[PDB]
Every structure is written in structure tokens, then in C-alpha cells.
RNA sequence: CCAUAGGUGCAAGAGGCGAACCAGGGGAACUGAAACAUCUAAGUACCCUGAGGAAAAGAAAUCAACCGAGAUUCCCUUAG
RNA sequence: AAUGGGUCAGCGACUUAUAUUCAGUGGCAAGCUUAACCGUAUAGGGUAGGCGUAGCGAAAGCGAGUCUUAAUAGGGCGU
RNA sequence: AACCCACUCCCGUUGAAAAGGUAGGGGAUGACUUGUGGAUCGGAGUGAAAGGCUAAUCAAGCUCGGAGAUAGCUGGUUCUCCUCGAAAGCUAUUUAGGUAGCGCCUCAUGUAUCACUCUGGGGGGUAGAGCACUGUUUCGGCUAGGGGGUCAUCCCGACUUACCAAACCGAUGCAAACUCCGAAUACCCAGAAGUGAGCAUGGGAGACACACGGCGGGUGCUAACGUCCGUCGUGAAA
RNA sequence: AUUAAAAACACAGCACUCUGCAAACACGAAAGUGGACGUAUAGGGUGUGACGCCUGCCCGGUGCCGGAAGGUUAAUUGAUGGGGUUAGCGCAAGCGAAGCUCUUGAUCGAAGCCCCGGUAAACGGCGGCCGUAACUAUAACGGUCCUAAGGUAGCGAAAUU
RNA sequence: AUCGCUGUGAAGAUGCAGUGUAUCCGCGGCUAGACGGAAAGACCCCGUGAACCUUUACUGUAGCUUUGCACUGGACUUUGAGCCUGCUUGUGUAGGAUAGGUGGGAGGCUUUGAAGCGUGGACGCCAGUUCGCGUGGAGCCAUCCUUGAAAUACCACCCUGGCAUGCUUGAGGUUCUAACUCUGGUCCGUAAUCCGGAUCGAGGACAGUGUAUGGUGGGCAGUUUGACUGGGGCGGUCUCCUCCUAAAGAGUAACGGAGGAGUACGAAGGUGCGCUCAGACCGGUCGGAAAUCGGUCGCAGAGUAUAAAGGCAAAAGCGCGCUUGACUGCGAGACAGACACGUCGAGCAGGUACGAAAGUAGGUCUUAGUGAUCCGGUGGUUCUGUAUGGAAGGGCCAUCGCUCAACGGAUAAAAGGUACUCCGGGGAUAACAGGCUGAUACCGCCCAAGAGUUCAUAUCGACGGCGGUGUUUGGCACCUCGAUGUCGGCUCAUCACAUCCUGGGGCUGAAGCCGGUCCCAAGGGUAUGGCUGUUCGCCAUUUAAAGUGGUACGCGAGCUGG
RNA sequence: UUGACGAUCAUAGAGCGUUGGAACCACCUGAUCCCUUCCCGAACUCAGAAGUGAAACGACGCAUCGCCGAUGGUAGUGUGGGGUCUCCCCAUGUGAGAGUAGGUCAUCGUCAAGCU
């Protein structure tokens, strides 16, 4: 369960942080979650915390 | 070879001692940290070299903010 | 049947200084008080400085309110 | 033999002596003994090496300074009276014989006679008891069972039932880590009568080595004035 | 020196190794002195200890000696990139020259180690399992297992059993 | 104003309780006691004590050694590299050749391109190319003449193979003298050969010395090396979860009995819609005790991501469709609790996913799956920004890297010895003796299967039970660490009786001599030697017999010291 | 005569036996059309009766299993005192579990609907 970052779609540097078992599923996820700057839901994506 | 070293003759000064004080040279450890290596203790103890009745330091290639203050030395605050 | 003391007479152990907190008793009182230093010197001057009379906030800042927050909602601290 | 040395016994141990004495021993022309004078020094000398000697001191002298070193460790702490009066528990610790917060004592300030001791509602799974579950146990029956004898078939039937043995019916016992059940007490909150001290903020501490006894328990050999807990009492401090 | 006189220390003898002279080595902040007014038949260090018969195998570990091919490897150099300021330009937003600076670090760098060999009178190390011969118990002989190699001569209930 | 004995008692009494004895006071002897006198125990444990030793503990250093920069020069050379210049070099499909090319030039008239055969050169992604033209001052490639991705002949810019030589510079090699060196020779100061100075001789840009840096370095130094512990050493254990001990509220110990964690999951989460287990049995193709299918009986005996406990029909269990509420700002109230951390949460506002709509969703049936502060690293952030304007550096918000796991974590960074030892303490704690206790011991006693030819009890007595003594192997840790001297021998002893000898005596498998066994009896006796430190033992020889225990395993202010 | 929704959770359960239609209810017919099946009109759904009370469902009977369950005694236990003291006894307050006598084939409420 390596840990990953989920950078927002819009311009803001707001992100979420979670973990993902890299070994079983290699591809990235596109979860739609809330954004505290634009005050509405957008979709997120990334990995690679550093 | 010249002429310096070197050697004599004279004049003037210094050398040694003393309790603390002052400026430089060299400079510990115990102990604190409830252990201990950075750090403290501490440039303190002690040890040398100078000088004076005091010494050192001093007359801006300094501080302040767009206002200004004009050498150093010492006490009281800023302030634990 | 653990320690100490042969008996007598002398001496022999919670102190000081500088900061600060709480109580007791006093002075002036939204104000109280001066340190060095001057001084015919225990008087007098000296109010620089300190504590108070208003807070909240990491800060700028705003103020009987202010901070967080999209907040004008709630809530923390304060009157 | 002088001389240098120190192998044995006894005496001495407040000695005559802070290392001797009386008897006996080893070397005694040499790696000898010794007189005078000099040289080597403190993490430093010397040493045919024992950690030996360096002024009766040596796994690093003696003396004066740093220095009234540091000591959760021992010992001691001095005149009278009056009111109140403990603890040897918990949590953490390079901690266990130290210390710090809460529990227990004291003196002030406040709010509350709060709050105790008597009577109404309330959960529980302990002693006991039980076998419905989980296990364990005895006998009897009826059997599955597989069979045990096996009648016994190249090799098949099934006689028999000598094997044993599920499972199921009936009687019968037992569990801290088993429950269809199930008290006494202890806890909570409410109601009142009488008699006699709760909460909160401040100052000051001491304690944190416990002892026995009764009633419930672990461990031990249901042994110890053994040892670790729960609760009441007495010592400590009568 | 003052509870231990020995089997302890010494020793003549033996071997190993370092030292070509302003020597190795020691004491000294340094000057210098010992060594030694000596010169490898000499001088330092380490072990064993007259004499007699002798001194076996293991170079993996650790140390010293020998070798450089290649790898890594120090300050020293500072290529390149990225960033600060601003002359300019832009309604603004922003891009931005030269200078000056702040980081980044390419190369350039020796011994050393890693490697490759030698040395055990250098520190050190020298195994197990079974089955086996006309009594045949026993094991000459035979398997197998592991290692850098698996204890020979001599001695043996011993200052060790 | 100082007796004995039996008890008690912080547990071995001249001083307590009970009861026996004793007229007051000396002198010579002896050493049983006064836990006798001397020495803050050295053995043993502790102290976040001290010394000095060891190494492969950690951090360093003396010393030795490598290379930069100084002191420090020229002469040639090999070789790297920058520099220059003029640059003349430029060969593949294919053009006549040849493409590094960008602008002028359409052709090019300096022997026109002299040609053209062949002249050498060096040349070659080779016959491909440049320069002499042998002749001789003689037309050429064709300027798209071609074709080729760009056409020549001519002027310009640069680059390349390199050509040369320069400019600088590194690295290596040789040589030279003038720096430095000489613990060489002979003059001088000097009557000295230390030290200078003069001159020859040797070495020579090396050696050596400063300063910066690598390596080696117990040669040397400052230091570290945990706790609980039925003594501490060895071993085991240090944090979190569930059950039992735990006494029907919470809580609650032991080196007390049993087990588990240091994670998984983008669906194993949300929501709507549906649906029920294991087992028993009988029927049924190659399975076959047991696969799939059908059926009746069931009444949770299954299941639950992961240990056990408590649960689960609105099923918290199973399937399918859409999805992201595994959301942001909060949070009245409480439960727990030394503190720091902790657990549950209605409701409000933002924006969402299901469902026709009420409504449900702030992760998973619940409880384990984890580590403060300081550091530093990365995204947002005007909040600050030391004259001013900016920046660097702070601050706040979000998030990453600790296993002294000794899990409230001493530091970025740590092992051992002491019989050479030392200081401060302790019977809060061990070894000797005492004390309480008897599992172990040793002495008995109850049932009696049996053998003893027959016959259980003349002698033994398996299987099992109930006691006594404190004698040895223990258990515990109450006394003593400002000292209670431990084993064997010598000397001297005293008491018990569970009797070795002698005395009296039931029974006998006792003919006689001898015996075996058990009751009564403590008066007197109760061996010399060999071997060992021995008590013990094993031997040789005796004797009426060579007893078993207590008395700090009697007895060191009585001796010895194996 | 029934049908819906509750109240109370076995003295309300299980088993056996009997019995009810054309009002209700259930089976039933067909899936064309809504709609459905990891295959199937089984279930789900739609248009619908004929036919039937068989099944199912309700009522009415049986204590055969189950379930409730007295009284008396007994176990244990709070406080005070005892004794022969790893266990019990006395005074006093409290008092099960198991078993016995026996019980149980439920009792209600709201509407629509059947004398009603």
C-alpha cells in the first residue's frame, strides 16, 4: 500500500492523500470529489507524493 | 686589492624587590546537563612579560531613517 | 544479643544578598511610585523607567469586541 | 671464617625492635661486596619483570592552589504551652531505597446543611444449581455402522453376530476459561422525618519499605509469622 | 625492602626480520645528543632456551611483502542549467539586455581499498557417518559426508584423565 | 544492689513469667558465657559511584604517509588542449564530377578552360579529385547540356580532414647551474673547529620546511556498556487486542493459566432492488464415503477479509444496477480520565450519489494493525519582510521521513575485565550457625494378595492408607554486614534411648551348642593400624562389644592449619 | 359470515382430527400488450373469468409433545456470637433451583364489511 497524492483538476494546489496497492492495479484513478476552493465537486488524479 | 666582520678605549642608561590594581602572551579540570562526547564551568584558576601612579581607550571611512544625533570612559534603565 | 555515648566544664548546626509570588497590617487612590545622581547630606529635588486603567489574533490589523470561516450562522477567549 | 644474604623451627606480637633475637643454613676471586662524589622524576623514571622500588606512603608520590569539588547516601539538629491530624495507594519514569501530578491532612475565602445515616424505581450473571449448548463419564437397550467368528462361494450368496463400535432411546455423574436458569449483598437516582461539615478557588506540607488478624481467592504441599490481590478492623500514631 | 625463593625471570646457544651511514631506532616543540668517534663476521626488534636425535600437513581468515591492467576515491578547477535585481517595453498584465550576485555541478585529481599473486622459527587451524576377514568379537580393507586442510613421528590415567 | 532451670520474646535472657537454690569480703588457677576487646566487613548486592587495564565499543588525536600551493629556475623534447591564419580538403540513389552549406554569379574572355592524348604529385564513401601542362601559349564541365532533392564557370562568409607555425597550457622525458643543501676538504676570526665568513667538491630544482587535504593510527586521551528478578548470574520479558483469575456496577496484582496483531480493500465502501444456512436423508450417466441436478426434513447446529469474546430477520450473511458521503467548515452535549492523547454525536451551512417519494450516506458487525517534540524536504499562501523598492529567511495551512520494539522515546553518534582493586551504604539482600515448615528423610503403625512343602502373621509381606522425631536434600528470608572466625585432627567432656556389650525375660519352622524376633532396663564399659586433607569408606588383625544421635553438624580470648 | 392494520409475545406453540364458499380469498386461463428470468410467465407483472375449496387459508375439537407452575422443605447468604476451626453450628433478617398437586388448543383494539 504505497501512498499517493490526488492533485485537483482546476488551478488550485489543493490535493487529497491516500494509499494504493501499486502491485495489483498499475493504472491511475479519476475519482470525483469536493474542492474547498471552487466550492464544488471536480475530478482528481495523480500519484507520486515527492 | 679596497673594507665590513672582529677587537680595545670612553660616555650615557638598564638589571633587583614590592600586597592589590591595568594591558598583552599561554591557558585547564572537577562540576552543571539528575548518564555523556557539542555546550557549560570559563578565556575563570594558575603561569610568564610589560608599564603607571593609575592604566587602557579616544576626536568618526561612527549611529540613525528621509527626522536627525557628533569623541572616549563610568553608574541607572531599556530587558532577562 | 542492632546503632551511638567513660563522666564533667567550655564552644558546636536553617544564615545573608539580589529578584519575585501569596497572606497579615499601613499610605495615598483611576492612579500609585521613583533608580542612579544632585543636596547646608536620614529632609528636599530627581517621574527617565515600571505596574495599572481593554481585549482578541501566529501576524498585519481591528477594537467592547475580536479570531476561525464562503460566515453575517455556530463556537473560543473578553467585557 | 670476616663479609653480604634470608631456607627451617621455637620465642616475641601492649615487643628490647612500626620486621629482631638464639640455634641451625646458602654464596664466599667474582653475572662479587662496599666507602666517597655525581646522573636519570610523576601518566615520568628505573626494573635478570614481582606491578617491584622512587625518604616507615605507590594499578601512577609528597605539598600548596582550583575548592566550603560532588554525594537521590549514613550520622546529628538545642526553651514551654494550646486546637487539628495522616500515608506506606494509582499513573509515568535509565525507573524500583529518588522524584512528579491525582487520592488522603492543614489553614483561609466563597457558595451551598449541600451531603451523610432511614424508605421507592433500577440493570447484573457471582454463590448455588442444572445438563438445553460446548466438553468429559458410567451401565443398559436398539441398532447405523462398518463387521469380529466368518458359514464361506476359482472370483461373488449370504449362515453365523465370536469384532467391535457411531447414531438413537432410558437411567447416571462433573467443569475458572460450559449456561435453559438464579438469590443474599453491594451499587445508582428519586421521598420524605429526625439527629450531626458538602462543593470550588488559593497558601503549606508530609506519604508513595507497610505489618498482622477475620471473611472471599491465585500460587504453594488447600505447608510456612511464605508470597501476590479484594474488603473491614487493630498496630504504626493508644 | 616487611607472610610467597619457585617449576618463575636470566643465560650461553638457535632461527626469523629490519638497517648502506646524515643508518633502522630512541629522547627531545626545535637546536642537538645516544647509537658509535662503531660500518652488515656490524647494530636494533621478536620468539625459543646447554647437549643429543629431530621439527609433519594447511596461504581459506587476519597481517606483512610483490604487482599494476581495470574499477571506485580527497581537497583543487567550474563547463552547463536554474534563480535574484532592473535598462527597456507594455493601458495594464507581463516579458526582459548588459552588469552584479545565489545556487547547480561536467570534466581535471594521488596514495588507499576492491582485485592478482607470495610468505606459517608471522597471528593462527589440524572432521563425521556406517558396512566389513573359517568362533570371528574386532577392523587391515570399503563406502559416504564436509574442509583452506583434517594431526605424522614420538609420548600417553601424565604439573593435563 | 551483676545466680540456675523451664517457658515467652525482633524468633539463642544476669534484669520478663513461674519456681528452685545462696551468710558478707578476698587471694591463687582455668577459659564455658557476657552474640567478650581491636578494625563504619574485604565475601555478596546496590550507587544513572572512582580508578587502572583490554579490544574488532564510539568519538577523536601523537606519529608516519599521498597529493595541491609557496620557497622554485632554462634548455630541448614526447603529448592533451584551447588560438590563428589562408584555409587549399567536401567521393553514397544519380549528374559529366562533387554536395556542409546561406547571398552574388548564368556561364564564365588572366595563357579563353588551350585545348586533346597522355607528364608526376599526393591523393581517393577509387580509377573519384586537385595542382605542371610534355607539346605547345592550342577551347572548354555547358552556363538544365544534363540528370540529380540543391548545377557547375566564376566572388563572398564560415567549418572540416588536417597542412603547416605561431600564440598560449597542461602531463611526461632528458640535461644544465644560479636558488636551496652538505653531521666534505683547507684558510680566516682564534690560543676553540661550536658558530660564522671566504673559496674550491658533491648533490640540484629533487630533498626539506610552512599551509590545505586523503590514508593508516589502543601509540594516547575522554568516555559509554539498561531494568524487572521469591539473592543476581544464565534464560525469559519491556507496546497494543480478546477471554479467565475479578468477589452479578467501574476498577484491581503475580517470572498466574490460554491465544492473537506491527495489516488488507477503489470494492470487501454508499444506495436501491431482490434472496436464504449447514447438515440428514432417498432418486439419479464414466465421480462416488463425499462434485453437479431433484426432491422432502430443517427451524442458525452455517456464514462474518483477519484471534477470541459479545452479537446479527429492518438479517450486520448472499447476489445484481447506478456511484464516490473513504466529502469541506463545524458541533449542543456527554462518557472516560494525573497530564498529554482518547470515544460517541444530534443538529446547522456548503455542495453531492442513490430512490417514485418519505429517507439513507461524515468508510468496513464491533473491539488490535501503531511513535510526542526538535530537525529538515516538498505544495498553497502578502502576514512579516532590519534606510527605501524588491528578494532571502521566517510565520500560518496542507503533507513527507524515528524500531535503542528498553515501544512517555537520555545523544547526530557507545563493548568488555579486575583474584591489584578503592569510597559511600545494607541484615530493604546471599553464602556459615539459629528460627518457622516437612515435600525429602529416618522410626512406626493399619488392611493382607501372597511364600514360608501343608499353613497370611516363626520369619517376610506386593497393592494402598494414618502418624511421630527434627537427624539431611530442601522451601521462606524474621535476627546479625559501625565483623556471630567456616571443614577434619588433638585435649576435655555432658545428656537422650529409638540398646552395640553385660542383666531380667513371651514366641520360634527353639533337640543340644548356637540363633531369629519382639517387650523391660541408661549402672559401668564401648580397639590398635595401613591408604586418603578427609568425616566416610575399603582392607589386615583383634575383642565380652568395637552403639546411633543432640550439645553454634560440642570445643581456635584451649592447640594445630593438612 | 370475511378482509386489512395493530395490541400482547408460547397458558398465544407443534401434532392430530374435522370443516368453510360462489360475498371474500386462493388456486386457475393466456401473455398479445406493460414487465420479468446470469435458462425458464417458477417468482415478478399485465389482461381476465370459466373451474375448484383439492391444495392453501380460516374456524371448530383433542393435553398425546411442548410451555407455564403452586404450597412445604432444602441449598446459599447480610449483621452479631460460637465451636472439635482446610469445615460447620446458634440468635436474627432473607430465601432459590430442581421436583410435586395441577394448568393451557389464548385475550383484545380500529375500520371496511356478514344477523350484524
UniProtKB/TrEMBL annotation:
SUPFAM superfamilies from the UniProt entry: Zn-binding ribosomal proteins
GO:BP terms for this protein? Answer: translation
The record's Gene Ontology cellular component field reads: cytosolic large ribosomal subunit
Is Membrane a UniProt keyword of this protein? no
Instruction: List the Gene Ontology MF annotations in alphabetical order.
Output: structural constituent of ribosome
Q: Which UniProt keywords apply?
A: Ribonucleoprotein, Ribosomal protein
**Keyword flag Nucleotidyltransferase:** no
PANTHER family associated with the record = 54S RIBOSOMAL PROTEIN L39, MITOCHONDRIAL, LARGE RIBOSOMAL SUBUNIT PROTEIN BL33M
- Homology family: Belongs to the bacterial ribosomal protein bL33 family.
Name of the protein this chain belongs to: Large ribosomal subunit protein bL33
Organism annotation: Pseudomonas aeruginosa
Q: Which gene encodes it?
A: rpmG
Amino acid at each position: 500500500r504505497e501512498l499517493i497524492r490526488l492533485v485537483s483538476s482546476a488551478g488550485t494546489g489543493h490535493f487529497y492523500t491516500t494509499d494504493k496497492n501499486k502491485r495489483t492495479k498499475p493504472e491511475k484513478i479519476e475519482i470525483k470529489k469536493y474542492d474547498p476552493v471552487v466550492r464544488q465537486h471536480v475530478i482528481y488524479k495523480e500519484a507520486k507524493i515527492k
